[PDB]
Nucleic acid binder design. Structure first.
Ligand SMILES: [Mg+2]
Ligand SMILES: [Mg+2]
Ligand SMILES: [Mg+2]
Ligand SMILES: [Mg+2]
Ligand SMILES: [Mg+2]
Ligand SMILES: [Mg+2]
Lengths: 213, 89, 251, 226, 59, 207, 90, 180, 256
RNA sequence: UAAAUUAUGGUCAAUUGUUAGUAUUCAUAUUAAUUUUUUUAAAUGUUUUAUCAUUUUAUAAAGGUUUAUUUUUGAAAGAUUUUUUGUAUAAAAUUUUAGGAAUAGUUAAUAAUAAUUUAUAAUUUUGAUUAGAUUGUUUUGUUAAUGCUAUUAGAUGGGUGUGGAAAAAUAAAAAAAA
């Protein structure tokens, strides 16, 4: 918005200064890992956990915290839900989109995400695995999605996983994949016990951007 | 409570409550009237709410900045006293 | 209710209470539900002022390689009916789908046909809407659509490319909500019009000797009602308006 | 919060209302949204005394010994039909009788046309599930000569409160598309003789005299002798 | 109303319906066996009215 | 008065289900083998079985398999009509059916009558087409039904359909079809090909 | 209602008279304006001590100054010859 | 949101709710009984001190003879007295800024004091509750309505800032010669 | 079961993500302790940073303490090379030859026109600054990284005569950059971090070598002790690698 | 290392046993208590709602804890056409038994690792852990007084995890959406 161009322009004018001595690092503190409160809070790199009244010199950001979005199928008791999971890397400024894929693959801790090949895309347009973040104007604020192989098949009943509510789960597939891990047959402590949202939660029509009634 | 009269729409059900709140148009009109009257009351009531709010804010301004007057004088005095004690030191 | 600050409660990996991510299925009527009211706005824009990529001379051609990094999101209008190459043709005859194009066909160009085109590899989509006849809007001379023969040979088509099963964001219609004035009503007073002399001003309100005819006497409704819609927080119709104003609800 | 009754005025709990806002008060429960509802209990509640002295069969009783006189079957069918209309008529019971499943017709619920309340629904399209009397119904809402831009699922289509009036002018074939009726302020130039506004945003109705009599005869102003 | 709800073990008299849990809640443990299979030929014998209307059909 | 805090969250908006407290305690071993026994009691399976974790209702596939393994009645079909009625229950009463009957299928169904038993069958089908399925008829519908009530030599049902045609939903009856039942016109229809009056006994005046 | 009331309220003369309760808030601050009788640093009660003493907050602090001039010798006759009683000046 | 509701002392919303000004005292023989005006939360615990925002005062509901003042031949003064202590800075704070609620009995009290108008529950059963019709009200309103700016300024002075600066104190506060 | 239910190291809030997002819309997952991993662990060091205009131009000359013959340092660095090359021989182009080992006291850009005025003037000021300073015994242990892990060096511990260095350097810093305006890549009011550069990746090399020296090589030598050295000799050097087989030396000062 | 006065100020410290050679707080005293007496408590049906459902209604059962108990606003208050924020879960002090010994899903680093990651680990004689007794840091009694001698009660793990917060299974005396 306004911030982005205000600070961009500020940086760009700062770089064209003929006369500047350079900052004194005894006057330019780092950040503290030690502050009150139990939680450990990660902030912007321009920001500190103490009060600093003075505005520090604009720096180019050498580690850009990209966010890459995935679609997961979350099991809730009623049936499957399709929701969103972000993976966040720190990708060096000049890095190549291939390398961004690689960093993204290493950083995900969920078993259900990276199984097949995925393509990075912005507003539905694929990115060249060949070229730099610089060219595509990728910043933290930029919205990056990720698209799997079978994702364009999800409108069918096949690729989309089958919920034991409406579908047979057989000794074929009891031993394979999220079904196996889930332990469909109830145990005393009830197995891994997944989040549940009921059937009448959204009414007769499911969740939408547009009000349908 | 919400008053449920006997001429409200009777629900014939054995699985639940015997009387659904649904109003004869008369009851609706009536309710509207009574509620107009209490509107008359609460108008003045909340009027007094915000009036007292600004009263309290204003008194806070005046007394608090009188306080800051006296207090600053005090701490200026203390600070003078200290730097003197340190010259003596 | 406001959105709470951060989630420290449940592990992130597991993600727990999350509004489902809405995804647009092209096989259902729901697709058109999303896309339609945009199209109309889009066409409206095209009727008033120019927008650059809206009008292409010919079908866009790209290699297989660059297919999915160029096409998706692209929306352009053509003069004739020619269906994009390597696209399986689906006729939309199901009435529920056709239904959402109602406003667009009545108050803008009549919709002759709708087509769902899916690429053979199945990962791309083209929504193709064929309009018949001239706009029911007036068309500006400097406007984009004035460069088209199908408006102002009377058929012409809108083409919209998209990926299947994506959120109703990355079909890009929201860039188009730029709003330009239709200058048709003032065209009367421009120095170009010869009907500007047939105009006469009313400066002063005319003397009136009669009051407005009084509304028919009020009949109080006879059936059971759900109670004050004020106290139930129901907007005046259950339709529109503010709950403070109870107008037009029964009493 | 977004839209309070009488601004915040707290002098009584009842002063707020029966719901604080139109919007759902907890975010985790969306269905708490303020609607316009309907007395489902009474309006389903179909009369079982209509089915007295009938001898219905069931669906899966196909047995030879089980079924009956064709005369008995006919009065059974008539009894069942009378049992289904016994409260009012459901949309899907009205729509199957009209041409083109009643596309284009204006469906008004009883209470929408009485008092200063004026509202109806132009039907855009219909999905009959295998069971009639149920389904989904979409259309445009028209409230006080002001119409919706896009179609919407008609709420409480299943509850039997509905009336309509068949006009050949409004009929649309399944081929074409049901146009939204014009909102009287915008598309059609406002005319007094064609359409007069029942009630407007700051208006409300005068006092009907029998209500006044009754309320005074309640509060004990006007006397009432046994 | 209140009499109706009273038959439920609701602890606070809250106008909710809470059922009980009997020791035998399902047919098989109540001693009941499988539902007896219908003799098919016996129920496919034509009814009386049908036979009478066959008698007046031949007339 | 909501059950929100009484039972597990997934049980919200639970209705019609018999003694829901059951499905609260099903995790416990004895309740679980109780359910094995119950599913075996319901039958239709090869193996010892139990419904999945938090489900109160039975699975769609399972009850579907229960429905399709359930043997239909009428093991003896003789008339073409009975065959067609079994096919009719197959197609249109199938568990969770999307499809719905057509007036043409009812004409077809109604043309296969011979004995009065088949009249009762076809008529109950018609009963389901009006009341259950809500299907508008055509003009020729009353033609069909009428000639059908003639074939079996019961004309009571025809005039009983006339005196009230609104509940049965015959929205058009040609006036001559009324006359034939009221007794005014000896004949209901003339077969153009035959150039004779129907029925034949009335056509005895035409000869 | 509000209007009729404002009218008959402004019409009566016993109003237009300040009401201490209705008009203002005397003190908004949670702490008092001056020290009243609370135990001291030694634990002694309000009655046992008077404020303003050594426990109180401190007051703090070539040529000739302006305080040199106002001063005058008792030997020289002063400014306006105010008839002091000899006993008092003693 | 309690599974088995505490049946005897229900409330509205979650606890602790919006602060409400209550009158409460331990129950005893009527001859000695006093009450406490207290700003506290909506949901009380066993001891009322756990949720207690402020202590507004003591109120003794026993008419008393005034032996503090000298016996006065004035008629009205020798009616019995009813004694109450109000903390009105805290009251105006809590009620005004914090937006409290009010039970009815304290309302009657503070009405007697002149802090609030008489409550909703104080009924002369002589008069009925009024009727209303919009056209008559409209005629009265068209008859009397003040100017827009007058009204806006009245709302300004009552709700927003009261103390304002006359031109004089401006002229007296603006700097003189050496920095002017 | 073998520890805290929620391990304390795993409790992390990301405030660089918008409020409300993590509660409803989506959850954000990341390995958060790669970033939180500190300056001691990673081995980074914060050097005086250049103003952009100075950052544009290559440095030409630098101040150096010359290591004498027969060092503990040179010996142990040779031992370290042996070990590293036996582990991974992909290091071979990264490593600096033991012949070029020197202590870098500061870096500077001299333009080629004013060259002689500047070298004479510098040399003189340098000789005046170091006039009073006797030789310096400094201690070397530990490794560190400059320029995002591209430069790998031996730290100079502030346990010894180092203190004196700091004044000494900060004087020439205030002469060379303060008095006669010269481009010291930092501020003259700021002190440079002295170091012995061991491995380095130049721009040309970077393609075949990679963008950062993998920490797996030097992890074990990170805190290794290279020993003590006394230093009498200060040089101002221009960087030419073929003139004498040692950095070409434009000026010299003896500490005695 | 000098006295002081413009004179009682800055608001009350005041102890009561008739014993039996002598040494040592020890029977019989006063005050405070238990012995000791029906003048302050109280009965069950919480309540709306759109109907077999869904909204409102969050710390008195027991167990015996001495390095111990700690927290938000997203509910309501709450004002307003739609998005808006950040601050919190952590600690420090005070901790009992006449005769006194070892304790243990275990410390710290790594990390959304490890039922077998790495290490020369952690608690204890400055009194631990088990085990007894015991409801923790404005409440009483005696007394001229540093003391001695009381103070109830209320937070008892998890197992489809709802809710803003578990405080959620009789036992009010909290008006709970006209
Ligand atoms: Mg709120
Ligand atoms: Mg307890
Ligand atoms: Mg113990
Ligand atoms: Mg402690
Ligand atoms: Mg602690
Ligand atoms: Mg438990």
């Amino acid at each position: 918005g306004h911030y982005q161009q205000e600070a961009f322009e500020a940086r760009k004018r700062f770089e064209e200064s003929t006369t500047y001595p350079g900052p004194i690092r005894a006057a330019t503190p780092g950040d503290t890992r030690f502050y009150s409160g139990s939680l450990e809070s990660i902030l912007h790199d321009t920001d500190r956990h103490y009060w600093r009244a003075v505005t520090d010199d604009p720096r180019v950001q050498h580690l850009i915290p990209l966010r890459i979005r995935f679609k997961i199928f979350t099991w809730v008791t009623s049936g499957w839900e399709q929701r969103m999971q972000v993976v966040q890397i720190m990708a060096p400024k000049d890095s190549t989109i291939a390398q961004v894929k690689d960093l993204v693959i290493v950083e995900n801790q969920s078993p259900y995400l990276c199984v097949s090949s995925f393509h990075l895309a912005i507003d539905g347009k694929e990115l060249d695995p060949q070229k730099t973040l610089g060219e595509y104007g990728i910043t933290e604020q930029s919205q990056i999605d990720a698209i799997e192989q079978n994702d364009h098949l999800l409108h069918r009943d096949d690729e989309r996983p089958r919920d034991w509510t409406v579908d047979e789960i057989t000794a074929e597939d009891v031993k394979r994949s999220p079904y196996k891990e889930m332990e469909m047959q109830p145990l005393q402590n009830l197995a891994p016990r997944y989040e549940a949202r009921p059937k009448g939660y959204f009414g007769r029509t499911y969740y939408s951007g547009m009000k349908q009634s | 409570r919400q008053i449920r009269p006997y001429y409200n729409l009777p629900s014939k059900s054995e699985h639940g409550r015997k009387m659904t709140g649904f109003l004869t148009p008369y009851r609706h009109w009536m309710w509207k009237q009574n509620e107009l009257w209490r509107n008359v009351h609460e108008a003045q009531f909340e009027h007094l709410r915000r009036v007292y709010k600004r009263q309290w804010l204003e008194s806070f301004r005046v007394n608090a900045d009188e306080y800051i007057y006296k207090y600053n004088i005090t701490k200026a005095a203390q600070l003078a006293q200290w730097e003197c004690e340190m010259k003596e030191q | 209710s406001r959105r709470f600050r951060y989630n420290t409660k449940f592990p992130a990996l597991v993600s727990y209470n999350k509004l489902p991510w809405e995804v647009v299925n092209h096989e259902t009527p729901q697709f058109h539900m999303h896309v339609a009211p945009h199209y109309e706005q889009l066409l409206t824009l095209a009727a008033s002022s120019p927008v650059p990529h809206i009008i292409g001379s010919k079908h866009i051609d790209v290699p297989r390689e660059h297919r999915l990094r160029l096409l998706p999101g692209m929306l352009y209008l053509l003069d004739g009916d020619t269906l994009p190459g390597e696209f399986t043709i689906n006729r939309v005859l199901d009435p529920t789908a056709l239904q959402y194009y109602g406003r667009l066909s009545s108050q803008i160009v009549t919709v002759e046909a709708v087509r769902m085109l899916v690429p053979d590899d199945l990962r791309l989509l083209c929504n193709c809407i064929t309009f018949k006849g001239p706009l029911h809007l007036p068309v500006a001379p400097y406007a984009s659509l004035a460069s088209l023969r199908g408006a102002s040979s009377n058929c012409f088509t809108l083409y919209h490319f998209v990926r299947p099963n994506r959120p109703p964001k990355e079909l890009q219609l929201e860039k188009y909500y730029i709003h330009a004035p239709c200058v048709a009503p003032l065209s009367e007073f421009a120095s170009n019009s010869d009907e500007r002399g047939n105009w006469r001003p009313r400066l002063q309100a005319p003397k009136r000797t009669r009051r407005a005819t009084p509304l028919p006497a009020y009949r109080p409704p006879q059936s059971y009602l759900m109670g004050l819609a004020e106290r139930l927080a129901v907007v005046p119709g259950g339709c529109f308006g503010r709950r403070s104003l109870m107008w037009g609800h029964w009493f | 919060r977004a839209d309070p009754l009488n601004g915040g005025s707290s002098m009584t709990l009842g002063s707020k209302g029966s719901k604080l806002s139109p919007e759902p008060h907890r975010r985790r429960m969306p269905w708490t949204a303020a609607k316009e509802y309907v007395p489902g209990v009474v309006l389903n509640a179909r009369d079982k005394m209509v089915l007295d002295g009938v001898q219905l069969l069931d669906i899966e009783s196909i047995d030879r010994a089980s079924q009956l006189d064709p005369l008995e079957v006919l009065r059974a069918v008539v009894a069942t039909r009378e049992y289904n209309i016994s409260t009012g008529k459901n949309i899907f019971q009205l729509a199957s009788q009209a041409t083109y499943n009643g596309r284009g017709q204006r469906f008004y619920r009883k209470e929408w046309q009485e008092g200063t309340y004026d509202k109806y629904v132009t039907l855009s399209a219909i999905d009959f599930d295998r069971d009639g009397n149920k389904g989904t119904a979409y259309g445009y809402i028209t409230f006080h000569g002001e119409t919706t831009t896009r179609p919407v699922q008609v709420d409480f289509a299943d509850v039997p409160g509905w009336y309509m009036d068949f006009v050949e002018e409004r009929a649309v074939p399944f081929t074409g598309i049901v146009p939204p009726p014009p909102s009287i302020g915008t598309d059609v130039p406002v005319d007094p003789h064609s359409y007069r506004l029942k009630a407007y945003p700051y208006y409300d109705a005068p006092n009907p005299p029998e209500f006044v009599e009754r309320l005074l005869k309640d509060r004990g102003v006007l006397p009432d002798t046994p | 109303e209140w009499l109706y709800y009273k038959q439920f073990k609701t602890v606070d008299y809250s106008y909710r319906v809470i059922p009980e849990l009997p020791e035998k809640y399902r047919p098989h443990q109540s001693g009941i066996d499988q539902a007896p299979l219908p003799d098919y030929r016996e129920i496919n014998k034509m009814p009386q009215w049908a036979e009478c209307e066959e008698r007046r059909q031949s007339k | 008065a909501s059950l929100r805090y009484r039972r597990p969250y997934w049980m919200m908006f639970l209705k019609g289900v018999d003694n829901w407290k059951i499905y609260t305690v099903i995790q416990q071993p004895d309740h679980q083998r109780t359910e094995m026994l119950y599913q075996a009691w319901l039958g239709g399976l090869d193996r010892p079985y139990t419904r999945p974790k938090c489900m109160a209702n039975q699975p769609l596939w399972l009850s579907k398999k229960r429905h399709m393994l359930r043997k239909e009645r009428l093991d003896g079909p003789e008339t073409p009509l009975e065959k067609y009625v079994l096919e009719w229950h197959k197609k249109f009463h199938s568990f969770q059916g999307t499809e719905r009957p057509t007036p043409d299928d009812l004409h077809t169904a109604l043309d296969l009558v011979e004995r009065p038993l088949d009249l009762s069958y076809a008529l109950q089908l018609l009963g389901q087409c009006r009341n259950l399925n809500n299907i508008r008829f055509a003009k020729e519908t009353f033609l069909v039904f009428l000639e059908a009530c003639l074939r079996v030599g019961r004309r009571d049902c025809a005039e009983y359909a006339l005196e009230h045609a609104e509940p049965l939903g015959f929205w058009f009856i040609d006036e001559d079809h009324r006359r034939y039942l009221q007794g005014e016109q000896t004949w209901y229809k003339l077969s153009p090909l035959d150039n004779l009056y129907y029925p034949v006994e009335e056509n005895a005046k035409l000869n | 209602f509000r209007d009729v009331e404002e009218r008959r309220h402004s019409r009566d003369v016993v109003n237009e008279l300040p009401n201490p309760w209705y008009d203002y808030v005397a003190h908004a601050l949670p702490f008092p304006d001056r020290d009243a009788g609370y135990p001291d640093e030694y634990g002694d009660l309000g009655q046992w001590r008077a404020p303003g003493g050594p426990g109180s907050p401190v007051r703090g602090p070539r040529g000739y100054t302006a305080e040199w001039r106002d001063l005058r010798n008792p030997m020289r006759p002063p400014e306006f010859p105010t008839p002091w009683e000899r006993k008092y000046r003693q | 949101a309690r599974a088995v509701i505490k049946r005897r002392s229900p409330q509205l919303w979650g606890a602790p709710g919006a602060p409400i000004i209550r009158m409460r005292g331990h129950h005893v023989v009527w001859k000695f009984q006093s009450y406490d005006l207290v700003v506290e939360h909506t949901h009380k615990r066993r001891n009322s001190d756990i949720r207690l925002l402020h202590y507004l005062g003591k109120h003794c509901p026993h008419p008393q003879k005034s032996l503090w003042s000298p016996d006065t031949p004035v008629a009205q003064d020798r009616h019995l007295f009813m004694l109450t202590t109000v903390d009105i800075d805290a009251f105006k704070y809590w009620f005004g800024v914090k937006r409290c609620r009010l039970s009815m009995k304290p309302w009657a009290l503070l009405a007697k004091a002149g802090l609030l108008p008489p409550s909703l529950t104080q009924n002369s059963k002589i008069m009925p509750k009024p009727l209303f019709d919009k056209e008559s009200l409209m005629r009265y309103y068209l008859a009397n309505r003040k100017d827009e700016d007058v009204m806006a300024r009245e709302k300004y002075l009552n709700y927003e800032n009261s103390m304002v600066k006359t031109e004089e104190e401006r002229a007296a506060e603006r700097p003189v010669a050496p920095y002017l | 079961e073998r520890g805290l239910y929620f391990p304390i190291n795993h409790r992390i809030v990301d405030h660089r993500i918008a409020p409300g997002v993590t509660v409803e819309e989506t959850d954000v997952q990341s390995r958060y302790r790669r970033e939180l991993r500190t300056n001691f662990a990673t081995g980074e060091t914060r050097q005086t940073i250049a103003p952009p205009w100075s950052a544009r131009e290559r440095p030409t000359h630098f101040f150096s303490l010359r290591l004498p013959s027969r060092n503990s340092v040179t010996l142990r660095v040779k031992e370290m090379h042996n070990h590293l090359l036996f582990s991974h021989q992909q290091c071979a182009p990264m490593l600096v030859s033991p012949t070029k080992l020197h202590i870098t006291l500061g870096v500077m850009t001299i333009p080629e026109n004013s060259r002689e005025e500047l070298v004479k003037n510098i040399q003189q000021s340098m000789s005046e600054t170091f006039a009073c300073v006797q030789p310096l015994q400094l201690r070397f242990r530990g490794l560190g990284t400059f320029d995002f892990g591209r430069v790998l060096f031996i730290r100079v511990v502030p346990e010894a005569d180092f203190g004196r260095l700091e004044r000494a350097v900060c004087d020439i810093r205030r002469r060379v950059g303060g008095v006669l305006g010269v481009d010291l890549k930092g501020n003259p009011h700021d002190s440079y971090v002295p170091h012995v550069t061991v491995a380095k990746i130049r721009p040309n090399q970077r393609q075949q070598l990679g963008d950062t020296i993998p920490q797996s090589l030097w992890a074990d030598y990170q805190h290794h002790d290279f020993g003590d050295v006394t230093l009498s000799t200060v040089d101002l050097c221009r960087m030419k690698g073929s003139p004498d087989g040692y950095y070409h030396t434009e000026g010299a000062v003896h500490l005695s």
